[PDB]
Amino acid sequence: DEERALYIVRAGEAGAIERVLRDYSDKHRATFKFESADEDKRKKLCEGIFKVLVKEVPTTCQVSCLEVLRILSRDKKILVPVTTKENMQILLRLAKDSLEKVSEFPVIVESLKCLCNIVFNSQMAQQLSLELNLAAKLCNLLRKCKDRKFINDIKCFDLRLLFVLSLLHTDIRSQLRYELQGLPLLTQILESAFSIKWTDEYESAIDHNGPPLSPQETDCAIEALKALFNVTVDSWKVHKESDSHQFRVMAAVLRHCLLIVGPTEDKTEELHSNAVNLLSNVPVSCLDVLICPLTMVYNGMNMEAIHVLLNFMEKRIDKGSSYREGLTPVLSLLTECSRAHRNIRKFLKDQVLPPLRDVTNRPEVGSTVRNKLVRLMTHVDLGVKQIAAEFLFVLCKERVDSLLKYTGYGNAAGLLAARGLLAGGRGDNWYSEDEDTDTEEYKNAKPNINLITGHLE
Template identity: 25%
Template sequence: MSPGQLQGPEKLKEVTRLVDSLDNDLSAKKLSPADKVQTLLALRQHGTNPANADPIYSDKGINLLARYGFEGETLDIRRAALRCIANALLLNKDMRQVFVDTGYAGRVAEKLKTEISDDEMILSRILFLTTYDTNIDFSVLITKHSMADNILSQVIRHAKQIPKNGRKSYSQIDELALTDTLKLVFNVAKLYPDLADSFTPLIPHLFKIINRIDIPDRQPLDGLIGYIINALSTLDLEEKPGRFESNPLFPKFNQNCNVDKLINILDAAVGVYNSEELEPRAVPLLHLLITIYEFAPEGPRKYMQWLLLPEDNDRSVPIGRSDTLSSKLLNLSTSPSVHLKTAISELMFVLSGKDADSLTKNIGYGFAAGFLASRGLQIPQDAQEAFATNSSRVSDHVNPITGQRYDAEPVDTGPPMTQEEKEREAERLFVLFERLTANGLIKAENPVAQAVREGRLEELPDDADSDLD
């Protein structure tokens, strides 16, 4: 009967026998290397379901597996034991501290200096799992066991595996190994910010990888690209003297290459995911673009503005209604997804020089007002006057409310409003304006009250014609 078919007491009895066999052989030395490998593989199979596998999920079991994982006489024995450990740490969080207490975590970090992706994957996964629910000291792993240096060697190795021309395929095991390593980098840098600088040397190589790999048609942020962006989002990207030979964000051969690839990824993502799916996936990318823009020289800044802000062509319809990336982002900025809409609005604000007036001119009052209010920023005086009087002070040819060109606005060819319709519309605008003023969103005289005061608006007499008669 195969390990997966044993259940209940029979499974527990067999797991106990296998663990005891390995334990006894530490002194008896009777099992051949092949026997040890088979025993460990059987334990791993039994351990895929923790029920009735208690001897594995115990101090004795983890310590025993750790000895075979680091002191086993062959690579196959060590690899099989480490797979058992990784499985146990994944399925039972209590075993993570048990493993840390064995004292072998440093050996895991040292073994990350390997040319075999299969081994890299399992070692990175073990360390990644210990970032949760343990008291592990990653500063010791970095300073005494070369964890950051060995991770750098892995990222460099993977960057070399991906050719510029894309003719050579990137194997699944290589991608899985790099993914686990990047998850480790993200967690350590995120949970222990003081250690994030240890991973700074990864930056140019991560950008090299992201430029060389293709953007998946489906779920562009669910695979390797997403993990690279997550890792980059935790690192300090500011160019500092002596840090790199040349700025990795804006390389001399093409200052816009990284910006271009990241915006293409964003464009692909907003075309595939809905707002709920985008929130956990795209927010790190949006924050990464914000950070890059703030460090960018003039050329890449103008390039990002050109790609991400509405262009004149977008203004043939109200802003947000075209099929461009900027319109899609602005529509997403009104979604219920709090972090997503905040990140998009922040990106537009940064692209507008963090200036409320420029933001309003770039994306229209309708999209800008909510963000400015949430930041406690006053609405630009030009926008207030435009809203109050329908003048064109914000721009000579653009409606400041909708962002549409005046010459592209539809002409009303319907019948003129009746006097009562005009009065009802004036009353509605009066109430709306009073609410905006009470909420502190605008500071200007109510245009309806102003019209009445100046004699430009009269109340209907009781005997006036009504379209409701």
């Protein structure tokens, strides 16, 4: 198969290549496992392709060659003899500096896809990326697309390449955050996808009857959120006073993201999951903009975003698969928000643990959110069984007496033993003065109560 293709490529006829390579790409489109009997021939074909892109050829021939090379580059072994500086310069030249021409967009898209594959698969390409300064050129290309139209695919694959480079290398990650202005530019991209019109300094105008998003805007937003997560991984280590204004705009943009829906019910979950993942890196002191509006309503504030987060967690608990990678980020974010603020903690306490009225049932049996969170407290995994206990422990002002009422000593024994207090005590933090919140029926039934089990015999 590859022998005839290589011969006709070496022949040099322009028309014949555009048909032979297209047929080859059509036959092999969904193959990912390769056998070792066809290696050498394939390798030769690869080199032949790179020998024809140097000369001037029509655009369709370039597109076909790039499509074939994308398919060949999936296998890791072939790239070793064909990863050289001269070869990479051709791909960079094809990808890039005037965007006036309109028929050359597919060439750019295909070259970017090939670069993604090559950089992920091989190892020397990551070392050459530093030498060739790929990141700065990518950022310049991103800035060149501020106002133009028909630019969604180029932006999406540019962001994908930036995400891969940031993920696989640390020097490039450090170059983006502290130099090159990574945080503003990417933020602006998000602000352009959602079409945000600011009403106040950190507030946005939201309409309930707004039209749903589009698939391409969803993909651009997802890629931008992933890249922004990789840029700001080490942000919480050291925080200055000159960075607050930059993080508050990001928090406001994410709050506007949490209040819209995607095209289908499956993309919305991915969008909200990526937003929740990014929100775990912002410093805690800049998260108050989540309840920024002053008009669910609590104490004359707007609390729709916290309700959305709570519904997200409740729906994620229902399916019983992969609790480690599905419940840790959102629970950690909710605990961190509740520790430092006052309105959020009180709203969540009134929503999750209402005053007690049912005493003839055990805490574990039931279908309310309190029952699910109590059931999660005895789990084989350690991370889940610790974070689910800490979330409920925060809402009760870190008092043992208020925790044992709702859950029981049996379910809370693990958390009590971990923190070094197995008797009556309090946490390190002090929140405010204790008050009375007891329902009347409970006051009748308290003398005859079971502390270990948590219900009335």
